[PDB]
Design a protein around this nucleic acid. Structure first.
Ligand SMILES: [Mg+2]
Ligand SMILES: [Mg+2]
Ligand SMILES: [Mg+2]
Ligand SMILES: [Mg+2]
Ligand SMILES: [Mg+2]
Ligand SMILES: [Mg+2]
Lengths: 19, 244, 178, 181, 195, 130
RNA sequence: GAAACUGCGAAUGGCUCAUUAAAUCAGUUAUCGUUUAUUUGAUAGUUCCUUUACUACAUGGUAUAACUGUGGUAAUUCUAGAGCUAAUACAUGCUAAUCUCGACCCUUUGGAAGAGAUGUAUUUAUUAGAAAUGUCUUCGGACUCUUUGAUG
């Protein structure tokens, strides 16, 4: 039997800037 | 000492846990349970140093007290519960199911499995005997006592145990050509087919194993775990398929 | 029983029975003053909450639900054009009564009504019926969190459809008689 | 108690420190590369001795031996990467042909001097220790820094340096202020 | 008339426009978000007619024109407003050019049949050479060395230029008036391309 | 300007949070206060500032960059439930508990050990005796 | 929720190297030579058996602390006398079943007149623990026999 398939990451990086 | 010990030094801890030597002075001492101390992975190490879901011991305790962790279909709240080989760890909240199988390096690997595969486990038959009132039973490597077994089941065979009911669904005899996983010694983690079982009366039996890559090696019978027929293992295998 | 937990212990963690949680629970979403993800929107309320729930919840059912409807909720016109299929999938998955996935689905159902209020009216009868079955289903598996999500979803729908339901308040009452 | 943290001496005193030829050698090397004391020369000599002894042991071993192939390939790769050994002398024999001057020439002080950012090796050291030189995006304040082949082209004035486009140092603006008053 | 309804109205009107233009509606919505998925979704190469192309050349007094940047308003699907800076600039295509003559020029290219039409320009010169001679003080309004590059802001509110004068000047689109100067603060920090 | 980037974002429904590595680039500035980062990660993830915690900021050698760890809880109540007490005190979500030093508490513990029972009987006995 | 009873722990941890010269210790064996709190997995319907003159819709002080109150000693993590009151402390003690065959009917989802059997724990003695190659049949199946397991 095959192993469970890996799940692509749910969360990703994110960015901003201020000042 | 005047009694059982209750502390474990980090340097004295098993190597394969891969514990930082400078983090502290003590390592988690596995509590009594299904698996021996040296061949077990306490839940704290698995949750913190492998999955990284918790950053410190208190967080692991908080996770466990929420009853989010199940071991072999049963909820465990002990931080140092000794999970071990062919143990199924379920985290419903993350929808994650893991089976503890050593890698080629010789360490427990984070191996994800499906629910259907997680519904069962495999146990090496360590002993077969008649209990009280003449009820036969089998004791497996994980300390499970299963009554009314199949008569054909003998020592060193492998029984497929359904976690929900704790009964024997099927079994695999120990014989040449069967697929085998090594659970001890320097060859720990390798996978290969049996070739011959050298039997020495009054001594340790030796088993010759042949890998898919045509290499051969000899290992004591105690480190042998039958997992299925060649090319048709009954459990999903980790990456590398126990090669090298 | 005679006396409630009026005096609180120094413990940080305390056991609370299911009945105990239910008694304290009160359905009034406006009273809550925690920041709401849907308050900040770029395209629609549904997409704003839908993106958030993808990153928090990892349940088997919600992940499957997201995959089906991910392509059809990228833009508000896409949601309006595909409103029928979105509602059916939301009702279909809520029917499974999987506690691990109810919270995102129920939240999205309310926000779905937020995006297309007047057009949700044709969905109004089926949404209430699905919630009623879920709440009736909720009795057998005790989880105060499920009740809070379900009724808050019901309250949100009333908030968004306040104008239309008020005109036929008796009809809304008739559904909730059971 | 906590497990020990290992440590090791990075240099070793030479066999006969008072050899006149050795004293002249140390004098010449320090003069060329602006070294602070004999400890640096001893350090480089010790590292070179280790490298050459390992190369000797590998050469003694038979060709096509797994240990020889693996370890010699690793050593050649490292020596090429640090730049001491060139791309066209990738053999252990040329490792045995290495000298202290090669390792000295890879020091960040000498590289800063050569590239023209400084007018002398001592000026290069002074610039380094005052936080003016950056190897890529990182400020390096250590003359004994060993520069790799790729990092060689990225040596430059640090953005924060007064020479690198920041505001003038305290002395400059102090003088400007008093002149203004 | 809460903001949610306003989006609904614009979306409703937008859908009506697609229906008037026209499966097709379902497909057309997908291409709107195809940009988010970084893959080719504009297969029109075989549809192009190179042979019938109407070619033209417009002479410019500047010597050695170095770069050109074009601004095109685009309708925002999320909010349904054009990228145009102002109502007057609704659907007006602009092109900005810079040259080694230290002159920045803008043209109107909205009418494809007609040639580009100059609107405004700004020229630099020796007047703008910095006196300080310090890199952080190179904050003069105009250019004093060869301008190499120019780029138009997607919002249509700003145009930015840079060159061998180691400066990045950002100008107001309508009037080519400088609003900020950002020195690169390096001796050889000569701007070579902007994107 | 000053930039923040979150990397290695791991969702942790077990503790009901999101854990990530925060990289802050702050040219021409000493460093960035924790409260500002909490405000701004809160704005980013669309959660309350009370639900955001940050720690372990170390400025890279030479300045201009800092790296640390950050947590964003699904709800403020969850953060109050799972966060360490000391971190809650840092952010003002919890009040510092005032207690005597360890030596004083231990001495009091020993003194109370010496006495058996409530001790009021001992008090009245000594009062009568003297 | 103070105090006290009860349960658990306090035999782990830490420190030092006095004694110790086949001793300790290292490697390697055995327990078919024995104890094992705890963890983990299994595991216990005994229906009846004359004073039924009968508590199990639940038994006693065969009992005390904490507590109230009277005291001794210069003094201690000292305690006496009297009075109270609890248990997962102590000591007692119960409540129309299941399984073999089964005649007779009936020919199955069958009913059952009746002949029978009934926990553990300790000690000892004894005992067990090793040419049916046919017939018919619906062609399936039935007819007689088997009957402990493990280790060298
Ligand atoms: Mg043996
Ligand atoms: Mg500086
Ligand atoms: Mg002697
Ligand atoms: Mg001996
Ligand atoms: Mg215990
Ligand atoms: Mg008494």
């Amino acid at each position: 039997p095959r192993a469970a398939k890996k799940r692509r990451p749910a969360a990703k990086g994110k960015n901003l800037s201020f000042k | 000492a005047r009694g059982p010990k209750k502390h474990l030094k980090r340097l004295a801890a098993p190597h394969h846990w891969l514990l930082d030597k400078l983090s502290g002075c003590y390592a988690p001492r596995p509590s009594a349970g299904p698996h021996k101390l040296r061949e077990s992975l306490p839940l704290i190490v698995f949750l913190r140093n492998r999955l990284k879901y918790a950053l410190n011991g208190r967080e692991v305790k908080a996770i466990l007290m929420q009853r989010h962790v199940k071991v072999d279909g049963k909820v465990r709240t002990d931080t140092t519960y000794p999970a071990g080989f062919m143990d199924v760890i379920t985290l419903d909240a993350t929808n994650e199911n893991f089976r503890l199988v050593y890698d080629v390096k010789g360490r427990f690997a984070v191996h994800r499995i499906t629910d259907e595969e997680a519904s069962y486990k495999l146990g090496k038959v360590k002993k077969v005997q008649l209990g009280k009132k003449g009820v036969p039973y089998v004791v497996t490597h994980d300390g499970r006592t299963i009554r009314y077994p199949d008569p054909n089941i003998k020592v060193n065979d492998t029984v497929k145990i359904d976690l929900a009911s704790g009964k024997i669904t099927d079994f695999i005899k120990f014989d040449a050509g069967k697929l085998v996983y090594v659970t001890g010694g320097r060859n720990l983690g390798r996978i290969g087919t049996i070739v011959h079982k050298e039997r020495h009366d009054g001594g340790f039996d030796l088993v010759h194993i042949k890998d898919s890559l045509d290499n051969t090696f000899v290992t004591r019978l105690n480190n042998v775990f039958v997992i299925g027929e060649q090319g048709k293992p009954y459990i999903s295998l980790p990456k590398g398929k126990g090669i090298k | 029983a005679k006396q409630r937990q009026t005096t609180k212990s120094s413990k940080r963690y305390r056991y609370s029975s299911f009945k105990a949680r239910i008694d304290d629970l009160k359905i009034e979403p406006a009273r809550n003053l925690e920041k709401r993800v849907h308050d900040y929107v770029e395209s629609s309320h549904f997409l704003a909450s839908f993106d958030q729930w993808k990153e928090i919840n990892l349940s088997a059912k919600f992940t499957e639900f997201a995959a089906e409807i991910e392509h059809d909720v990228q833009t508000l016109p896409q949601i309006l054009y595909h409103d029928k299929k979105i509602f059916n999938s939301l009702v279909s998955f809520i029917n499974f009564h999987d506690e691990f996935s109810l919270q995102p689905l129920l939240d999205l159902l309310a926000q779905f009504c937020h995006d297309l209020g007047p057009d949700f009216l044709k969905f109004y009868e089926e949404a209430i019926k699905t919630l009623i079955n879920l709440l009736d289903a909720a009795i057998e598996f005790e989880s105060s969190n499920v009740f809070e999500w379900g009724f808050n979803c019901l309250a949100y729908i009333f908030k968004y459809l306040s104008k239309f339901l008020v005109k036929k308040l008796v009809l809304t009452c008739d559904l909730l008689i059971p | 108690p906590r497990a020990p943290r290992t440590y090791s001496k990075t240099y070793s005193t030479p066999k006969r420190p008072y050899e006149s030829s050795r004293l002249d050698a140390e004098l010449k090397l320090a003069g060329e590369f602006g070294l602070k004391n004999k400890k640096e020369i001893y350090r480089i000599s010790f590292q070179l001795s280790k490298i050459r002894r390992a190369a000797r042991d590998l050469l003694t071993r038979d060709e096509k031996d797994p240990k020889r192939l693996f370890e010699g390939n690793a050593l050649i790769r490292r020596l090429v990467r640090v730049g001491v050994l060139s791309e066209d002398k990738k053999k252990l024999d040329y490792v045995l042909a290495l000298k202290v001057e090669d390792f000295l020439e890879r020091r960040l002080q000498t590289q800063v001097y050569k590239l023209g950012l400084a007018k002398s090796v001592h000026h290069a050291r002074v610039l380094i220790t005052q936080r003016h030189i950056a190897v890529g995006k990182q400020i390096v304040n250590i003359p004994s820094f060993m520069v790799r082949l790729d990092s060689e082209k990225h040596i430059d004035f640090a953005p924060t340096s007064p020479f690198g486009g920041a505001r003038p140092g305290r002395v400059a603006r102090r003088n400007a202020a008093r002149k203004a008053e | 008339e809460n903001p949610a309804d306003k989006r609904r109205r614009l979306a409703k009107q937008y859908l009506e426009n697609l229906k008037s233009e026209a499966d097709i509606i379902a497909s057309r919505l997908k291409e709107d978000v195809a940009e988010q998925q970084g893959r080719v979704f504009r297969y029109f190469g075989d549809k192009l007619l190179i042979s019938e192309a109407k070619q033209s050349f417009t002479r410019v007094g500047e010597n050695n024109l170095t770069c050109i940047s074009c601004f095109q308003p685009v309708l925002n699907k999320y909010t349904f407003e054009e990228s145009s800076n102002g109502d007057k600039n609704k659907g007006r295509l602009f092109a900005y050019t810079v040259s080694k003559d230290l002159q920045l020029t803008k043209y109107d290219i909205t009418d494809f049949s007609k040639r580009p039409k100059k609107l405004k320009y700004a020229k630099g010169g020796a007047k703008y050479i910095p006196t300080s001679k310090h890199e952080y003080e190179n904050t003069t309004e105009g250019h004093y060395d060869e301008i190499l590059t120019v780029a138009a802001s997607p919002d249509g509110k700003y145009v930015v230029t840079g060159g061998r004068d180691r400066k990045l000047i950002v100008w107001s689109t309508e009037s080519l008036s400088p609003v900020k100067v950002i020195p690169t603060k390096d001796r050889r920090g000569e701007v070579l391309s902007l994107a | 300007a000053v930039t923040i980037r979150t990397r290695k974002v791991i969702s942790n429904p077990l503790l009901a949070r999101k854990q990530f590595v925060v990289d802050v680039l702050h040219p021409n500035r000493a460093n960035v206060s924790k409260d500002e980062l909490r405000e701004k990660l809160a704005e980013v993830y669309k959660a309350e500032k009370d639900a955001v915690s940050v720690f372990g900021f170390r400025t890279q050698f030479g300045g201009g960059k800092s790296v640390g760890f950050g947590l964003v809880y699904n709800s403020v109540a969850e953060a109050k439930k799972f966060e360490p007490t000391y971190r809650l005190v840092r952010y003002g979500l919890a009040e510092k508990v005032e207690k005597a030093s360890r030596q004083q508490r231990k001495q009091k513990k020993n003194r109370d050990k010496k006495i058996f029972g409530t001790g009021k009987r001992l008090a009245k006995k000594v009062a009568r005796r003297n």
